[PDB]
Design a protein around this ligand. Structure first.
Ligand SMILES: [Mg+2]
Ligand SMILES: [Mg+2]
Lengths: 49, 158, 152
């Protein structure tokens, strides 16, 4: 019966996913900023080559 | 009182998800006025007084004609499961239609759909497909995905 | 056994889950399991067969079982158990590398040697249903699910 009554459940997974979203979003923004900085520097290395 | 479709509860319990069972059983809690779970005509009449007011006695009598006297939620869930037995999931039908479609996207043209439904021994008829057209989005050739059809069938977003 | 207030045995969430369970499990919803309510649920959830022999256990809780009696009969067998998180944390004292596993022989040694000792027969009786690897790994993480949410 427990899988059925386990439907009776609290909201904590949604806020945990909200935190996961925020952490991943900030990391991906940092990664893309560093990527674009490195890419512009690489284009300057092309000019120097 | 009780009646027993034992095979129906067992199978349909396995067929549904705990989330879908939550939808069904919580809806049946919404029907009942009692706190024990015994649905009966007056319970449904209070639901109708909340959503779809002033029915004739014919509505509740026809419901009782389907639902054999007072009902518990497991009997109610199996009354629904009898209608639900062999319902293909909405994800499955959307993905099948996407694989069928030559645009690989799940779109369909009005006459192409009409033929596909009707043709080579398929039992559909002109009004049978016209019923689908009235359930369809605004243009019957309108490149709409089958997400709309499953949305109106399920009345749910997932 | 002891006769305290029943709530002391169970956290509010656990007794709330038992209340939900009993409201589902009582079938003619008079407030009590009778033998028909039980076999109705057993057939409805389970397969086609019905086993009236189980009536020789319904009688065990005396009279038609009120929710306080239902809770009593579950709680007196359930007592002496602890949450899933503390059982995982207990296994962590032995899985020093946190592999998520203990060796079958090493867990048998740990259980048989110390504290209030298991018999090797009791260990093998766990192993007759517990998840196990032919390579020897006891994946205790799964065992904590099987001990509370599982049993197939
Ligand atoms: Mg009612
Ligand atoms: Mg009862």
């Amino acid at each position: 019966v427990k899988p059925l009554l386990q439907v009776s459940r609290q909201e904590e997974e949604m806020m945990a996913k909200e935190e996961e979203l925020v952490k991943v979003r900030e990391k991906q923004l940092a990664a893309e900023n560093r990527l674009t900085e490195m890419e512009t520097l690489q284009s300057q290395l092309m000019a120097e080559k | 009182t009780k009646k027993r479709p034992q095979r129906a509860t067992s199978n349909v319990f396995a067929m549904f998800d705990q989330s879908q069972i939550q939808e069904f059983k919580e809806a049946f809690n919404m029907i009942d006025q009692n706190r024990d779970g015994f649905i009966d005509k007056e319970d449904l009449h209070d639901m109708l007084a909340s959503l779809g007011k002033n029915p004739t006695d014919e509505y509740l009598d026809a419901m009782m004609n389907e639902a054999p006297g007072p009902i518990n939620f497991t009997m109610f869930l199996t009354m629904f499961g009898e209608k639900l037995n062999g319902t293909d999931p909405e994800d499955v039908i959307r993905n099948a239609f996407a694989c069928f479609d030559e645009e690989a996207t799940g779109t369909i043209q009005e006459d192409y759909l009409r033929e596909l439904l009707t043709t080579m021994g398929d039992r559909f008829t002109d009004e049978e497909v016209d019923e689908l057209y009235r359930e369809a989005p605004i243009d019957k050739k309108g490149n709409f995905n089958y997400i709309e059809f499953t949305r109106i069938l399920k009345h749910g977003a997932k």
